[PDB]
Amino acid sequence: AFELPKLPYAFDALEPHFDKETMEIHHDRHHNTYVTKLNAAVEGTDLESKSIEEIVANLDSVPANIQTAVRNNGGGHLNHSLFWELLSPNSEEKGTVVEKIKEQWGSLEEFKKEFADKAAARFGSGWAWLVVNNGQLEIVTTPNQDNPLTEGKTPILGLDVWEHAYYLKYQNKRPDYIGAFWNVVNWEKVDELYNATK
Amino acid sequence: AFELPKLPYAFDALEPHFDKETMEIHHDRHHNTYVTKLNAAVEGTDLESKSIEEIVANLDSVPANIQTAVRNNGGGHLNHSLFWELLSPNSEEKGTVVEKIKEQWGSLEEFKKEFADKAAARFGSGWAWLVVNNGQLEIVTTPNQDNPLTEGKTPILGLDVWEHAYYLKYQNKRPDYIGAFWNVVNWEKVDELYNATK
Ligand SMILES: [Mn+2]
Ligand SMILES: [Mn+2]
C-alpha cells in the first residue's frame, strides 16, 4: 500500500540549518519504519485502500485493535511526508500565508515568537503546527505523531520536535533548532496547503 | 530545596556502552533543567521540604495548578536520580533480584527479552521499568517522565528510552542501546530497592 516518498532535495541541501546525517537517518530509517509498521497495521482492513489523510482525519473511527498502531505510524507517515515537502533550500518569506500571518499577528516575527514558545513548551515527543480552523489561523502542538486533522483542523506548517529531528547537531538546545527552521521553510508548500482549504 | 545529585562515577565510566558526551549532557543539562523547573514549581510550598519520591507518589493529590510541572520535572528529577544510581562501571549479574527473576521468568535472558521488547515498543518519549506489585515482579513502561510510584508500584530497575539517552551513539537503533544497558546495570542497587519493599 503506502510508500516512502523521495526527498525533494539532497540530504545536505538544508545545511547549515538541518544537518545532512540527520536528514538521511530521519528519512531513510525513521520515516521508512513508520511506513512498514503502517502497512502491517492496515493490510486486510478497510483502511488499506484509503489515503493517509483520509485515515488520519477519521482516526477516531479506526477499530480499537489497530487504532494505536495506525495513530502512531499513520501519524508518522503523514507528518513526515508533509515535513519533507514543507522544507526548502531556498525559503522565501512571501506569499498568501505570510500575508495572512502578517495581518493576524502584526509581524512575521511576532508569529515566530509564539510558534517557538509553543514548540519549545511541548514536553516529550511531538510536533508544532500552524493550522487553519474554520478559516482562522492558529498555532497548536500535539504529542507523538498525532495530527490536528484528527480534530478537523487542517495543518499547513509543522515542525518535528522529536529529539531525533535535532539531537545530532543541536543536542538539548531545541530553541536553536526552531530558530534554524525559519531559514528552510517552504512557504510555497504552506500556501498550497492553505489554498487547498478554500 | 532540590539539588542536582552528583554522579557516582566518571562521565566516561560507562563506555563503551553509554558515551561520555551523552552522560555529561544528560546529567548537566537535561537533569539540571528538571531540577531548576521543579524548584520553581514547589518553592515556598508544602512540597519544597518533602522527598522527591513522596511528591511523585502522591502526585494525584498535588493541586491542579502545579500538577503538570511537578509531574514532568519532578518525575524527571526522580527518574534520573534513580537512573544514575542504577548504573555501574562494575556491573555483576547476581543477587536477590537476579534470583527472583531466574525463578519468575525461567532465566535472565528470557526476562531480558521481555524487558527489551517492551522498552522497544514504548512509542515516543518514556521509560521502561521493573516494578514490585502485589509481591510479584512485573515489567511496565510509562510515557514521558511518569513513574509507576504514582500508580502505587515501586520501581526497582529503570531504563530511559527518551531519544536524548541514546541518539548521539546509537541514533535510531534503540534495541542496540537496550542491549548495551545490560552491561552497566547496578544489580546491587536493584536489590536494595527490592529489599526496601519488604
Ligand atoms: Mn520525525
Ligand atoms: Mn533522560
Author numbering:
A (entry chain A), B (entry chain B): 2 to 199
The study reports:
For example, Staphylococcus aureus has a constitutive Mn-specific superoxide dismutase (herein MnSOD), which is catalytically inactive when loaded with Fe, and a second one (herein camSOD)1 that is stress-induced and cambialistic—that is it can use either Mn or Fe. This cofactor promiscuity enhances the pathogenicity of S. aureus by enabling it to survive the oxidative burst of the innate immune system while experiencing host-imposed Mn starvation. Each monomer presented the characteristic fold conserved amongst Mn/Fe-SODs, with an α-helical N-terminal domain and a C-terminal α/β domain connected by a loop. The active sites were enclosed between the two domains of each monomer, with both domains contributing ligands. As shown in Fig. 3 and as expected, the Mn ions were coordinated in a distorted trigonal bipyramidal geometry by H81, D167, and H171 in the equatorial plane, and H26 and a water molecule in the axial plane.
Preparations of S. aureus MnSOD and camSOD, shown to contain exclusively Mn by ICP-MS, were used in crystallization trials. The crystal structures of Mn(Mn)SOD and Mn(cam)SOD were determined by molecular replacement, using B. subtilis SodA as a search model, at 2.07 Å and 2.30 Å, respectively (data collection and refinement statistics are provided in Table S1, ESI†). Two molecules were found in the asymmetric unit of both protein crystals. The dimers of MnSOD and camSOD were superimposable in the protein backbone with an average root mean square deviation (RMSD) of 0.744 Å by least squares fit. Superposition of equivalent Cα atoms of chain A and chain B of MnSOD and camSOD gave positional RMSDs of 0.232 Å and 0.229 Å, respectively. Most of the differences between the structures were found in the loops connecting helical elements within the N-terminal domains. S. aureus Mn(Mn)SOD and Mn(cam)SOD can be readily distinguished by their 94 GHz field-swept echo EPR spectra. For Mn(Mn)SOD, D = –10.60 and E = 0.63 GHz, similar to E. coli Mn(Mn)SOD; for Mn(cam)SOD, D = –10.66 and E = 0.43 GHz, comparable to the R. capsulatus camSOD; and for Mn(Fe)SOD, D = –10.46 and E = 0.33 GHz, which were the same within errors as those previously obtained from simulations of the Ms = –1/2 ↔ +1/2 transition. In the S. aureus Mn(Mn)SOD, the ring plane of H26 relative to the Mn–Oδ1,Asp167 bond was 180°, while in Mn(cam)SOD it was 167°. The 94 GHz ELDOR-NMR and ENDOR of Mn(Mn)SOD and Mn(cam)SOD are remarkably similar, indicating a high-degree of structural homology even at the level of the positions of the protons in proximity to the metal ion, in particular those of the water ligand.
